[PDB]
Design a protein around this ligand. Structure first.
Ligand SMILES: Nc1ncnc2c1ncn2[C@@H]1O[C@H](CSCC[C@H](N)C(=O)O)[C@@H](O)[C@H]1O
Ligand SMILES: Cc1cn([C@H]2C[C@H](O)[C@@H](COP(=O)(O)OP(=O)(O)O)O2)c(=O)[nH]c1=O
Ligand SMILES: [Zn+2]
Length: 405
């Protein structure tokens, strides 16, 4: 049995996705076929209800000099983070000399707006190649992990932060207690720690098991985040559901008692309770539906091949490593994957070794079908790929069900 990373409680497994590769490792075709693998399985703590993986991948295996995800590759996300930055400039960052720290700034998708407002800030970005892209934009960035000690160092030299923000980062960090002790050291007494990450309620409702992989250690809910804050000196004082990345919640933590929670917190807590979101039976039902999607997806991809139809994929997502490796889906069924990220092109996907080609290569003559791994970006991708569909090309989705359209 594994100990909960939040409270030390016991974690009960409910889904085992088997042996998996690093999701963001893209190999050159000529590289030795040797990969780090680990067991990906997910459990729920008995005491605090935190849904979490049962085996940690060490941070430095995932995040380092060549980490390939470039946030600013999606226009929807550029706009989503610009808007969030302007909202913070209008509310939490209005004093004399405000200071915002972002955990996991990546290429500077959010902090660019803060920098262009002349607000003092610092991005933590331990993946140095994307850090350098943020620094090219004028952003102040430290190429370190946020944790207790690096938070203390920033408090020492920069003073308190009015906002600490983390998007698609806190749930990557098993050492969430260290991060919380760092937020406690660094946050102003009237500041907020705000984070947004894939939401358990969405994962369960959409059976989007691809949101489960090495970099998503936690699948947060309002119930577990409320517990986590409380256990650590903070309080959950707002929630906002976001449509990005398949469904997220943005959580606002304050020092306990310093602000009164919005009605939104209790409403979401009560909906989670009402729908038995984190009950083990629900979480098992979700696991059973994950297997049903596997079996339906592979039967379709097999039938397409038997009927002489070409199939490729669209989006070399981190997410897709779970799909191809759990389902057994390799270049015999999905010939290539198209992606706009230069450092993933002319590479093979992890585990399954499907070749990745630039999206500019997805063009007449089109394949019959494209398996949409970037299904959280459907609207943005399809708007750019209307010629494909007008030609008769069709999308295969596996969220929330296997279907073609
Ligand atoms: N302890 C830590 N502190 C700060 N950044 C971290 C971290 N562990 C991982 N990261 C960074 O967290 C990032 C997660 S990817 C998400 C990036 C971006 N905020 C977005 O929403 O698109 C990677 O860039 C990774 O290097
Ligand atoms: C929005 C968009 C993304 N992509 C690619 C870039 C990324 O490698 C991938 C989308 O990944 P994303 O869904 O953002 O994250 P993850 O890697 O966590 O699953 O799809 C395109 O090729 N075209 C596009 O229009
Ligand atoms: Zn716990």
């Amino acid at each position: 049995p594994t100990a909960c990373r939040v409270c030390g409680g016991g974690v009960q497994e409910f889904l085992d996705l088997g042996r998996q590769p690093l999701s963001d490792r893209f190999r050159k075709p000529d590289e030795l076929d040797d990969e780090f693998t680990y067991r990906l399985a997910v459990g729920r703590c008995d005491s605090c209800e935190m849904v979490q993986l049962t085996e940690e991948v060490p941070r430095d295996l995932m995040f380092h000099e060549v980490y390939p995800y470039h946030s600013s590759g999606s226009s929807v996300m550029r706009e989503h983070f610009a808007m969030l930055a302007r909202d913070f400039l209008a509310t939490e960052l209005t004093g004399p000399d405000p200071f915002i720290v972002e955990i996991g700034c990546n290429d500077g998708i959010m902090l660019r707006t803060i920098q262009e407002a002349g607000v003092r800030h610092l991005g933590f970005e331990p993946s140095s190649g994307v850090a350098a892209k943020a620094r090219e934009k004028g952003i102040r960035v430290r190429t370190d992990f946020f944790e207790k000690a690096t938070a203390d160092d920033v408090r020492r030299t920069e003073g308190p932060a009015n906002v600490i923000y983390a998007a698609n980062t806190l749930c990557h960090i098993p050492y969430v207690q260290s991060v919380l002790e760092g937020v406690d050291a660094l946050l102003a007494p009237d500041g907020v720690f705000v984070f947004e990450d894939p939401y358990l309620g969405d994962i369960v409702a959409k059976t989007s098991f691809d949101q489960i992989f090495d970099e998503h250690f936690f699948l947060f809910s309002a119930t577990s985040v409320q517990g986590m804050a409380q256990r650590c000196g903070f309080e959950l004082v707002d929630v906002q559901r976001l449509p990005v990345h398949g469904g997220e919640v943005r959580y606002t933590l304050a020092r306990q008692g310093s602000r009164t929670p919005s009605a939104a917190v209790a409403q979401l807590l009560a909906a989670e309770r009402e729908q038995e979101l984190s009950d083990m039976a629900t979480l098992r039902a979700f696991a059973g539906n994950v297997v049903k999607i596997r079996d339906e997806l592979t039967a379709l991809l097999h039938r397409l091949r038997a009927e002489g139809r070409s199939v490729v994929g669209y989006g070399a997502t981190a997410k897709s490593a779970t799909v191809t490796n759990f389902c057994g889906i390799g270049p015999d069924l999905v010939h290539s994957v198209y992606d706009t990220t230069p450092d993933k092109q002319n590479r093979l996907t992890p585990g399954a070794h499907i070749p990745v080609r630039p999206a500019s290569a997805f063009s007449d003559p089109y394949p019959d079908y494209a398996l949409l791994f970037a299904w959280n970006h459907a609207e943005e991708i399809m708007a750019k790929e209307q010629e494909f569909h007008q030609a008769g090309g069709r999308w295969i989705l596996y969220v929330p069900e296997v279907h073609i359209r």
